[PDB]
Amino acid sequence: WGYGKHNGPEHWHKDFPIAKGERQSPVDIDTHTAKYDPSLKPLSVSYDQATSLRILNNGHAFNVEFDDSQDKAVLKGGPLDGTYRLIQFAFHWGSLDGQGSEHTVDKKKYAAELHLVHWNTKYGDFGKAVQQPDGLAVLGIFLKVGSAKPGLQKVVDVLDSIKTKGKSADFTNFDPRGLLPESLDYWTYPGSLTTPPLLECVTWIVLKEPISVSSEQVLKFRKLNFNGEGEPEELMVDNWRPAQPLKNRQIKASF
């Protein structure tokens, strides 16, 4: 599976049949149909204690991993029940500034999208949580091009070291708080992972307010390779899945 014409999103259903299930992601956020729910609590992000370990090129994107052996970096509050610990964060981006995010707002596409992945500690490990309807909590953050994001530079300067599939690099003391928007206003709905296995185990929490990044930051993202080293060079660009049918589900707003 991939993002190409022969193995792209339109083909994933052949190997992963849930691809056309009932609670697939991503989706279009229709702001006029989203329902203001007064019973939603503020989100509670505790990341001062976060411990980053490494960054890796998995062949479909780049992931920053975190030590999830104790409640060091956690998410709770909002629509969530229990504590979810940060396991990884990744990005989805495009070939141009006009496309890239997975989720869309009234059909509008952002330059990229940041996903902070967290699992329900009630289930003991990540592997057990992805087998649960309330197993994960992904925090989605939209990226728009404007001014540079101080907090994202550390990530950008290390992309050179993990250009190709399988490459990984020690990546300690990275603070995720540097990637948060000012506001925590969000939209929330029940969905799935956006890449196979597309498990319908996620509580999506998409932040209203986008972060700005400079043109040159995003540019270094587009220099990543899908391919392994020593193979024909395929630029890692447009690694995002098209919006799926809402199908009955309803999107709630904390605002």
Side-chain angles (χ1 to χ4, degrees):
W1 69 268
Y3 298 96
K5 186 90 187 159
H6 293 109
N7 60 355
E10 73 281 342
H11 292 264
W12 302 347
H13 67 105
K14 303 183 280 201
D15 285 294
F16 306 101
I18 192 161
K20 35 180 157 225
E22 310 307 288
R23 46 176 283 186
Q24 290 288 295
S25 302
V27 306
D28 179 51
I29 299 176
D30 176 343
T31 83
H32 302 282
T33 263
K35 234 275 182 153
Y36 168 78
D37 178 10
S39 65
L40 257 36
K41 306 86 164 209
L43 293 165
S44 188
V45 196
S46 291
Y47 297 152
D48 65 293
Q49 231 50 254
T51 322
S52 59
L53 305 162
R54 60 107 99 144
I55 196 185
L56 97 153
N57 184 332
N58 69 13
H60 26 280
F62 74 89
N63 300 186
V64 172
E65 309 151 346
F66 287 83
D67 170 357
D68 63 353
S69 59
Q70 310 175 89
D71 289 6
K72 307 182 165 162
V74 313
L75 205 211
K76 49 203 160 51
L80 306 171
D81 281 317
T83 303
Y84 293 68
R85 304 172 183 165
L86 175 81
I87 191 175
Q88 41 127 343
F89 75 69
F91 299 80
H92 297 266
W93 62 91
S95 48
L96 295 318
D97 301 348
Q99 63 187 50
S101 55
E102 294 203 291
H103 289 85
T104 56
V105 169
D106 296 328
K107 307 261 200 257
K108 171 183 179 42
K109 301 182 157 26
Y110 290 86
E113 187 179 319
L114 168 55
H115 296 145
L116 287 89
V117 181
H118 310 71
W119 57 270
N120 200 332
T121 70
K122 85 165 76 178
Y123 304 116
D125 65 75
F126 184 85
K128 287 299 194 177
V130 289
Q131 299 170 188
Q132 317 291 156
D134 64 355
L136 305 185
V138 185
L139 234 184
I141 306 178
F142 296 123
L143 271 68
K144 67 176 179 144
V145 167
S147 306
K149 182 66 160 167
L152 195 68
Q153 196 67 33
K154 268 190 60 161
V155 171
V156 154
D157 290 341
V158 72
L159 290 172
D160 271 335
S161 292
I162 61 152
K163 191 172 164 78
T164 55
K165 189 179 182 63
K167 296 295 195 182
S168 70
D170 296 341
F171 192 70
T172 60
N173 309 102
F174 169 79
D175 187 342
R177 284 169 304 178
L179 312 190
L180 287 183
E182 177 186 313
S183 199
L184 288 195
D185 285 345
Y186 65 90
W187 293 280
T188 189
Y189 77 100
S192 73
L193 297 170
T194 72
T195 72
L198 308 163
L199 301 183
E200 296 178 324
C201 69
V202 182
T203 294
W204 286 88
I205 301 153
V206 189
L207 286 48
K208 163 176 48 193
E209 186 191 338
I211 77 186
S212 64
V213 298
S214 66
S215 203
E216 12 316 272
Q217 289 182 310
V218 67
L219 267 193
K220 302 198 181 171
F221 283 27
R222 291 171 199 152
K223 286 182 172 209
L224 259 39
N225 287 174
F226 276 127
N227 62 281
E229 185 185 0
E231 310 175 345
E233 193 160 10
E234 186 177 351
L235 299 182
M236 180 197 297
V237 298
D238 299 318
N239 54 344
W240 46 270
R241 175 184 192 199
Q244 305 296 304
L246 187 55
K247 286 182 207 174
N248 93 213
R249 287 169 300 187
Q250 192 194 50
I251 307 171
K252 296 166 179 183
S254 74
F255 63 97

